[PDB]
Amino acid sequence: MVLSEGEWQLVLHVWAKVEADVAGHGQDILIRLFKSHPETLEKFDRFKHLKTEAEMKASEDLKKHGVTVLTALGAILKKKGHHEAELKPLAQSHATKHKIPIKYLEFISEAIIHVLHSRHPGDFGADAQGAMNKALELFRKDIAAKYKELGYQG
């Protein structure tokens, strides 16, 4: 898995758009995730109370967590596939007591692609989508590598 420099620039260009409204993109992404995969809600102590889309839209926890997730992801994306010791740790929040399975990272990757296309169709066409798919694949591989190194089940 490798992105060209041109593909990394597509990823970073749309990420700048994300960064202009991180809370809105984070909300849209988690709502899409939980509507697509309502079974994933059970793994999250801070989200178990949220059943309906209305409840999700009004949740400060969900908005906060969206920002945390995108910020953690963004820091990885901006490394452009390179690995730095300082980013070795696995992000961890009080939202869940569990190590989240890798498959859920596949689920959220689908949601990210959907939401970016929804909000930014002009600048998120097939080329940018392919690039983001590759970047998110590398992201998931990185996380799986961390779980292996630390002894966590993914």
Structural domains in the chain? 1-154 (1.10.490.10)
24-51 as b/e: b if 16+ CB within 10 A: ebbbbbbbbbbeebeebbebbebbeebe
Q: How far apart are CA 88 and CA 66, in angstroms?
A: 21
Q: Is 94 annotated for ligand binding?
A: yes
Detail the DSSP E strand segments found in 68-114.
none
Resolution in A: 1.6
Q: How many CB atoms lie within 10 A of CB 140?
A: 16
Q: How far apart are CA 63 and CA 7, in angstroms?
A: 29
Structure tokens, 108: 């959220």
* Structural determination approach: X-ray
Beta-carbon contacts of residue 102 (< 8 Å; ≥ 6 apart): 140, 143, 144, 147, 154
Position 19, amino acid? E
Contact 77, 111 (CB under 8 A): no
Q: How far apart are CA 37 and CA 31, in angstroms?
A: 10
Q: How far apart are CA 74 and CA 85, in angstroms?
A: 16
Structure tokens, 144: 């799986």
Structure tokens, 93: 């929040």
